[PDB]
Amino acid sequence: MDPKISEMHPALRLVDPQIQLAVTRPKVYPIILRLGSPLSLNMARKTLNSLEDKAFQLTPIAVQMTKLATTEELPDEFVVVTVK
């Protein structure tokens, strides 16, 4: 039990709404992280569709995150991903 949402342990962060979780049920949810550890995101694509010479390219994506000031900033529905 933490004194406020901007100061939780581990930190609570909203992920930039440019990245959300899609669930087929497809509905899109904001992601709240509980950051028990860092994580990273890479976009990947198979560039050659070829059994004998298969190639993938990856690009790291910087994930902007927001600290919340009050529980008014928590949406009505969202997912929580708890790391570590």
Place this chain on the structure above:
Amino acid sequence: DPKISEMHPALRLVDPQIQLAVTPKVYPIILRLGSPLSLNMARKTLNSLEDKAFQLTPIAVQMTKLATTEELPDEFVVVTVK
């Protein structure tokens, strides 16, 4: 370098019922878990003047360790946990 089947953390494909929406392109997720991750759906079930309550419901999502690169989709995101 090792085959898909030799890497730690293992590459896990997440149930494609759960994908990452990026801006609305949606992407299958590959997880590499140095540490455990959990996923909960949250719903505010109460908002009075006094207090808020959120119901959290675990999603135990199906994952598969990949053994061949052929199991990899044409496009996907990789989420690596430290």
